[PDB]
Amino acid sequence: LERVSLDAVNLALLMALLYCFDISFIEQKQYIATIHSRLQDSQLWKLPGLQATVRLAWALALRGISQLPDVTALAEFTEADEAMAELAIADNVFLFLMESVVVSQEEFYIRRVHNLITDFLALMPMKVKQLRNRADEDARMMGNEPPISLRRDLEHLMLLIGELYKKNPELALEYWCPTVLSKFVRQMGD
């Protein structure tokens, strides 16, 4: 998949990859542990953005997997997850989601992606706050559009939602139906 950045064809593989990370339990988790380690190493690649996304996605999932404590106790959150995820965000992991989402086997894709999108809400909130706070402080009171956009990772996430959810109401309802998304919306409102 790396040996594709623009190539739209990448979308075809997203269903398999999203779902694959979704079912990490299946792997073992000797294997899962190895992948996690390899990925942290792989932060070398900024040029491949889509590697960065998928890895970030894996992390969003991994956190949930570590719920069976044998894995979680073993790991240190700051080193094991936050540092890497943060690096990925810096390396435009959100931007490429936005691109995947904006430029929308539909069933497999929609389902797997919406699972992805939601996983991020529930499991990720620490990252959201980290970014939000980061953004508020960063700009100072002649900003160019590029400067405005640099830090914009949180907004990009919101757009990700906007593109993915648009039309699709089905999916959109999930937000409203129960009073974490509903929490997400309240949070975003703040």
Add this chain to the structure above:
Amino acid sequence: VFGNLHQLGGVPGTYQLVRSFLNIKLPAPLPGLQDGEVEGHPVWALIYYCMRCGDLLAASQVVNRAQHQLGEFKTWFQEYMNSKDRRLSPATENKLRLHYRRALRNNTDPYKRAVYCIIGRCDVTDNQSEVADKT
């Protein structure tokens, strides 16, 4: 100051003496050019000269009163002052440096640059453009 005028209108405070130096002395042949001035006074020049005099505390106070908007710097001035004057926070110093490079370094009012550079030890390549007037 100790020689005619007004005699300066106000009290002999150190701050005013420096205002006099800046105003009466050669910042103006007949006043003007590229300073940031509020109510007839170059604030940054003032801070710089007060600093030059060794009156750091007063300089700090001037900044406090300043009406400015680089205010993060204001924070970094006060602790520079508080300590031995080698203001070393294990924290921000790094942050101040980045701002200097991006915002301040390519631009601004000479005195402002001086204050940032000198206090911060921002850019070790050394020299202040416009206002080094004496050996």
